[model samples]
Every structure is written in C-alpha cells, then in structure tokens.
Target: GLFVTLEGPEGTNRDYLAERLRERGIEVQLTREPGGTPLAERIRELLLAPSDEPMAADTELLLMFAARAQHLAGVIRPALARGAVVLCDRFTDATYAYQGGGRGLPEARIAALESFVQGDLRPDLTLVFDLPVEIGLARRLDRFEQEDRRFFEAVRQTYLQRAAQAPERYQVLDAGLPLAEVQAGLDRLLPNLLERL
Candidate 1:
C-alpha cells in the first residue's frame, strides 16, 4: 500500500492541494493528524484552542502521541491494511519537526513518542511543501490567531531538518509558486513517486 504524508509549516496549502488532488481522481485516503479518530479529535481541540495560560511543551508532546496512538490503531493502520493509499495530512515526522525541533522538546521524548506510536508502520513517502516561515505564518494568522506560536516555529525547523536528513523519503516542493505551477510539479513528481512505492 502507498502511504503519503502531506506536511509543511502552518499554511503551506497542504489541505487545499490534497483536496485538489482528490478532485483530480487520485485514489487517496486523506486523513489529518490529532483528529482522524474520535479520540484524536477531542485531543486536537485541546491542543488548538486558545487558553489564558500557555501550554507546556511536554504536555503538547504527550497529547500529540495520545491522539496519534488512537488514530494509527483505529484509522490509519486499518486503511493501510485494506491496501488503500493513505494520504495523511501530517504524521510522526511532524512531531519530530514541530514538537521536538520547533518547540525544543527533549529529543528523547520525541524519540519515545515515535517508537511507541509507530512501532513498525512507516509512510512510504513524505512530501514537504516548502515556503518561507513568515509568509506561511501570515496566511495562518489571516485565518485565526494561534495560541501556540512557539510550536509552529518548532514545526518549521523540524521540517527543514527532515528535508536535509532524509531527502529520499522527504521531497521538498516550492510551495511559494503559483497553484498551477505547483500542480504541474506534483503531476511530474507523483508518477515516478507512485511507481517507486
């Protein structure tokens, strides 16, 4: 089964493009992190909601994995078992980028989360839609004010680190380009990418 994860900073259009790809008749099972499952959705609300007090990095990390554990066991792994192409909106790698790298959580904690949630299953491909940090964050702010700015910053750093370290699995695309141009690139890249998987 093919598993692809769409990821980027706050507003790199991963959701928009994933939907567009679906409309184009791609057979993909799209799912978002921290909310794909019922339990996860509840956790997601806690994670995103603006609060008077700041959230602890460790709490964020724990909550993320708590949702992920349920999501993988309930939704993601099931579809993959059925041979569906899983197009996850974000995944384990995101934890590495956002929580560990972006928020400066302990590396050991992140590693533990990775090991626990993803015992063996791994995405076959991970596409990182690359864009400038300020531009992406500005787009996000237009939609809503973020309660956790530090987390997003951590996420950006993590994404870059992933691109540099695992260039094979992590394909970085120029998200700053126009939509049409981006689509063209995706068209060119997807065939070979699918063929390999």
Candidate 2:
C-alpha cells in the first residue's frame, strides 16, 4: 500500500524520483491524477479544455472525482495490489486547495466528496513542492494557471495547513531549487521514504 503522491509545481522530478527508487529494487509506478486510465484521460481533457461558459465549482469538483474514481479502479488499486510504489502526481488534496481554498468552497464539502470517493484509500505520503507566489507564477490547466495571485496564495496556504496537520504523511520540498538540487533533496529523503515503503 505504498501510494505516494506528488503535489505542486507541476511534474519535473517524478521520473527522477522513480528512477532512484527503481535503482533500489522497488517497483515504481509513476502515474498522475485526473487521468490515469482511458476514461480518466478523457475526463482530464475536458477538465483542461478552456470553456466559454464558466464551469460550475460543483461540476469541477465532481469531474475531478469522476476521473479519480477510474484512476483508482484502473491504476492505483491494481498497482498497490501488485506491490508497486505508486508515485502519483496530485490527488484529492488538489481539490481541497484549488476548490476549497482557491474557489472559496467549504472544506467540509470537499472532505465529504473525498470520503465518498476515496473512502479509506489515500496516498501513504504526499510530497509537496513548495514555491513562492512570484516564483511559481513563472510557470496550467485548464485555466487554473491563469488564476489570480491571491488564489494561488490561498491554494499554497491550504497545502501548508494540510501538511502541517499531518507531518508524518506529508513532506515539503523546495521547488524553487534547480533540478539537480531537487533530485538531491529527494535522495536525502529516500531513506525515510524507503523505511516506510
């Protein structure tokens, strides 16, 4: 049940992390959210596609979980059963941040959907790549990349709060660092990650 999720700053280091873990003889499954299976991938396209009409917040939230449902069924659970280190990019926490924080939806609503969708399934560890707003602004989906700075701030703080609330389940890494340095950071954390893996 080694489901590790990577959040924030896009996906620059997951392959490197997967490589290192594989070097250690661990079966690593590097995948991502909103799209892991065929249906989920289509859902992702819809989610990422720009819309002339504003997408209702609730619709956005449900679609995310809708994709997640297939991802878990098609990718996550099967990988976990096969004893692989499921290295996924983003998870339900994105909803808690983007929807609950960025869009000002209530945490309870997100949590409720979280429970309804995920039940007891969740990542064993979630590595958050932290970056300042000014630095992060230098970086999509859908229209999320074009959001206001304050919304990004809110999203960042939401991740911070969640990480703080569960130190054992989350690790914060500096995404502002160079790729080499970021890989080094992952190397340092490898022992801890492996100890649990």
Candidate 3:
C-alpha cells in the first residue's frame, strides 16, 4: 500500500496525474482534501466559498482538520489497507503551506492538529509541483486570484522547505514546463515508484 500526495500552491494538474495512473493499470484510489467523503466535501465547499464575513485563521485550520479526519477514516485508511495506491490531490502539506505560511499561523499549532487528527499516518511519497507564483496563478481561475503575490510566495516557500527536509520521499518537479513535458516526467517516474509500492 502506498499513500502519495500531490502538493503545490495552485494550478497543479493533480487530477490529470491521477487519471494517468489509473490508465496505466494501477489500482489508484484518487481523492483530495479537505474533502474525500460526502461529509468532508460539504466542508470543502464552505472552506473554498468566497465569504464577506472574515474567517479567522484558527477557524479555517480547525475546519480543515475536521474534514481531514472524516476523509481519513472513511476513505483513505480503508483504501490503503486494501492495498490500493492512494493518490491525494492535497494533504497536510497544503495546510502547512496555506495556513502556516500564507496566513502566518504558527507551524507548531498546525503540527499539533496534525498529530491529533492524523496520528502517525502520512504520505509515503509526495510529489511537489514547483512553479513561479505568477505563472501558477495565471494558469488558473479561482478565489486565489484575489490573493496577493506575497501570500502565494510564502506558500511556495513552505512547500519547497518541506521538500528539502525530506528529499528521499519528495519529488519536486518543474510545473512551469509544458504539460507534455511534465506528464513525461511523471511517466518516467511512475514505473519505479510503483515498484517500490
């Protein structure tokens, strides 16, 4: 069983990579956070929806963990237990980047929540889509457009920092490359990755 996560600031084609894995005959349990199960998905809508009322950083962080708890118990753990390759679009890494870095929340606080909600469970491998903040945002249309470049830059830095901390388990790919080139890089890496799984 393998738990793999795709992490980035935004505009990373995690769905495409998941689809490619399935097409390649891998038993892939494709999912995303802060949603995977039905209940978790409802939380996801609230988390992503544009709101006039400001949501506190702590509130946002707690809600994320709430959804993650549901997702892990109802979807992720079971899939992994049955020997499926669980490819998550985003995991705790997103929390570290978005909340800890972007919102300027303390990493210790996020780590505490992670321990309580996730215990020892973590991705066996993490594929980080590294790209310039401007290029990544330009590639997508979403609420993220409203955010300043500094926010995204902080998020990107956190991702890069995490990858650097665990080079053996993290594959940082150049997401600025053409789609074909990025996909080719993934295609080249997948066979060896699958063998390890």
Candidate 4:
C-alpha cells in the first residue's frame, strides 16, 4: 500500500489524473483532505463556506487538523491497512501553503497540530503540480478574492520549498505545460508506482 498525494494550488488537473488512474484499474483509493469522513465533510463545509466575520488564523488551522484527524482515522488509515493505494487530492501540504504561507501562520503551530493528528504518518509520494502563481490564479477567480497576488506567490513559494526540502518524497511537475504533456509525465511515472505495489 502506498500513500500518494497530489499537491497544487488549484486547476492543476489533479482530479483528472486521479480519474485516469482509476480508469486504468489501479487499486487507488481516491480521497481528499478536509473532507473524507462524514464528520470531516461537515467540517469542510464550515471551513469553505463564505464567512461574514474574519476567521482567526489559529482557529482555521485547528479546524483543518480536526477534519484531517477524522479523515485519517475513519477512511485513510483503514483503507491503507487493507492494502489499497491512497491517492489524496490534497493533504497537509495545502495547510502549509494556504495557512502557513497565505495566512501567515507559524509553521511551528501547524507542525504541532500535524504531529498531534497524524503522528509519524506521511505521504510516500507527493506529486506537486508546479506553475506560476499568476497562471494558477488566472484559472480560478471564484474564491479567495481578498488574497492578492503576493499571497498566492507566497503559497507557490512554500509549495516549491517543501518539495525542494524533500525531493525523495516529491515529484514536481510543470503544470503550466500542455495537458498532453502533463498527462504524459504522469503516465511515465505510473509504471514505477505500480511496480512498487
């Protein structure tokens, strides 16, 4: 069993890749962070729904971890224990990008919460869809309007930094490329992944 997570800002074709894997009959349990289990889904709604009042940085971080705790206990861990490949849309990496980078929260706080919720658990492979912050932001304009370009730049930088820090566990892909090219890159990586299984 392997824990593979797809990391990106938004509109990086992560879902498309997951669907391709599923269609290929891979034993991948496709899931997402912040909303896997029933309780976690509810938390996701609370976290995503537009808020009238501003949310505190600490409160947002705690809620994210709370949902992750339930997701891991109720879905992820159990599925992996049964020898299934887990393909998560996003994981703690998003927390580091969005919360730690976008919201300017302390990495120490997020790390503490991660330790409490997930212990030593970590993704075996994290495929990061890399692209310019401007390009990624241009693809989506529905939410996070308050966040300026600089904020997204920080998010992108954080993602790149994490990938650089753990090259062995990460595969950074150029998401700005054409769809066929991106798909081909993923296609090339699949054989090695399947062999591991």
Candidate 5:
C-alpha cells in the first residue's frame, strides 16, 4: 500500500495519473484533510469558518490534529488496510507549513501530535503546488488563506525546508505553469513513483 500525498491544487494531472496507475492495476484512493470522514469534515468547517473572534493558534493546531486523528482512524487507515494507494490532498506537512511556518507556532508541538496520531504512518511522497501567493491572493481570503505576504513566505520556505530535509520524499511542482506543462511533470514523476512501489 502506498500513501502518496499532494497539496496545493491540481486535479486533471493526478486524475490522469490515477487512470495510468489503474492501467498498472494499482488501486488509488483519493482523499483530503481535515476531512475524509463525517466528523472530520465538520471539524474542517469549524477550522475554516471565518471568525470575528479569531481562532487562537493553540485551538487551530489541536482542532487540525483532531480532524486528522478522525480522518486517519476512520478513512485513511482502512484504505491502507485494503492495500490501496492513498493520494491525500493535505497531510501533516500542512501543519508544518501553515501553523508553524505561517502562524509562528512551535514546530515541536506539532511534531508531538504527529508522532502520537500517525506514529509510523506517513506519506511516502508529497507533491506540492504553490503559485506566486500574492497572486493566488488573487485567489481570496478564507480563514487560513487570510494572511500577509510574510506569512506566505514562511509557508513557502517551510515547504522547501521539508522537501530538502527529505529529498527522496518530496517534490515541488512549478504550479504557475499551464495545465499540460504541469502534467508533464506528473507524467515524469509517475514512473519513479511506480518503480518505488
């Protein structure tokens, strides 16, 4: 069973990858977080809902892990049990990116929760997509999305930091490219992925 994850935003590229994997007869499970279950999705709403009263950093961190624990215990673990490739949209790396890097939280605390909930469970690969953010700010202002350039810079650097620390475990997509161009990256990546599998 492979637990391959992707963050940022891409669909047709991975959708094509999915069909290709099926062509190899690999079963792929597409999922995301802080979701993947009823309770988890609801928790996601709580996290995302804009608050006139801002969510404290501690509350945000714990709620995320709570949703993740539910997501892993219910949706994620079972998929792994059946020996399917788990293509997750976000994972613990997001906590590293958003909470620690973006919000100035303590990375060690996040790591503590990571060890407790996921234990040995972790994504074998994480593919990321981040366009120039202030531009993606052309994107909008969700609870998590509502942050300054410095916050985004930290998130970007954190992502780079993690990928560097575990080069074999990560890839950053040049997400500003056209769809077909990005597809080529995923296409190139697929074989390396399957070879490891």
Candidate 6:
C-alpha cells in the first residue's frame, strides 16, 4: 500500500498539482482534511467557517483530530487496502503546525494525538509545498476573496518546523519557484518513491 500526503502552508497549489498527477494516470485516492469522509466534512465546515465565538486552541486541536479519525477509518485506510495511493491534502502534521506552532499548544498534546490517531499507519512520502507565510496568505486571499489569515499563519509555521525536522520524509518545495521547476523536482523525487512500494 502506498500513502502519499501533500502538505504545506495554505495556498501552495498542492491541490492543483495533485489533480495534475491524477491526469497522468496515477490511481490516487485524493482527499483533503479536515475532511475526506462524510462525518469529517461536517467537522470541517464548523472549523473553517467564520463564527462569532472564537475557536480555542484545544478546540482547534480536537476538531482536527476528530476529523482525521473519521477520515482514516472511513476513507484513507480503506483506499490504501484497495491498492490506491492515498494522496491526502493534509494529515496529522497539520495539527503539529496549527496547534503546536501556531496556537502555542503543548507539543506533548500534539505528539499524543499522532500516536493515538495514526496508530500503525505511516505515509510513504510527504510533499510539502513551501512558501513564505505572506506569499501563501496573499495567494489564499486572492483565491477565496477572503480567509481566516490568523489560522493560516499558524499553519505555515507548523509545516516549516516539521520540514526542517524531518527532511528525509518531507520534500519541501519553494512555492515561489516556477511550476515547471517544481514539477522537475517532483519528477526527481517520485521515481524513487515508487521503489518503496
């Protein structure tokens, strides 16, 4: 089974590239968080939508893991068992980024989530579309017309920290670079990835 997750700061074009990969005949089970399953999608709507009440750090962390648990049990694991490459838009690393790096949540809490939620599961490769926080937020705002900038800032810091710490499993790309250059980098990395399966 091959599970490849695409992660990065928001607005890094990870979704766009994953679609392109699909077009090239990769049988990928492409899905996003805080969703992928029906129940998870419900959780995602609550998390992303603007609300009058502020979302607390613990709330954020719990919501993320809740959605992920549903995604894994209902969608991700099943797809992998069927021999489809699970191309996830985000995963547990997101909690590390948002809760730990962005919201100043305890790393122990985030690490605990990882251990409990994922259990024995592990991804074969993680593609991180790296970019400066400002650039990432700018592109995100352009796409959405408006967004929760505060949440995105937290997301960026979390991803960068993870990339720095786990250079081997995480391939960090400069999203500022040309798409073709990024594609070239992917080309170099993806072939070796196939060897793992």
Cα lDDT tens digits for candidate 1, 64-99: 999989988898888878766788888888788777
Give one digit per residue, the lDDT tens place, for model 2 in 55-103.
8988989999999999999999999999999999899888888888898
Regions of candidate 3 where Cα sits further than 4 Å from its true position: 12-16, 23-25, 140-145
By TM-score, the candidates rank as 2, 5, 3, 4, 1, 6
* Per-prediction backbone clash count: 3, 0, 0, 0, 1, 1
lDDT of 6 by residue, 1-80 (tens): 67888877866355555555577566677788889878999998888866677777788789899999889999988988
Q: Pick the candidate with the highest TM-score.
A: 2
- The candidate, 4 or 5, that scores higher on TM-score is 5
> How many clashes would you count in candidate 1?
3
Q: Model 2 segments beyond 4 Å from truth?
A: 9-11
Name the runs in model 1 displaced over 4 angstroms.
12-26, 140-154
Pull out the clashing pairs in model 1.
97-158, 98-155, 102-154
Q: How does residue 174 of candidate 3 score in lDDT? A: 91
Error of 1 at 54 (Å): 2.7
Candidate 6 is scored at a TM of 0.85
Q: Lowest summed-lDDT stretch of 10 residues in model 4?
A: 137-146
TM-score per candidate: 0.85, 0.95, 0.92, 0.90, 0.93, 0.85
Q: Give all candidate RMSDs, comma-separated.
A: 3.1, 1.5, 1.9, 2.1, 2.0, 3.3
Residue 22 local lDDT, model 5 = 85
Full-model lDDT, candidate 4: 0.83
lDDT of candidate 5 over 100-196, digit per residue (tens): 9999999999999999989988898999876776655664356877667888888877888898899899988888889888888888898888876
> lDDT of each model, Cα atoms only?
0.76, 0.87, 0.87, 0.83, 0.84, 0.76
How do the candidates rank by lDDT, highest first?
3, 2, 5, 4, 1, 6
Minimum summed lDDT over a 10-residue window in model 5 is located at 7-16
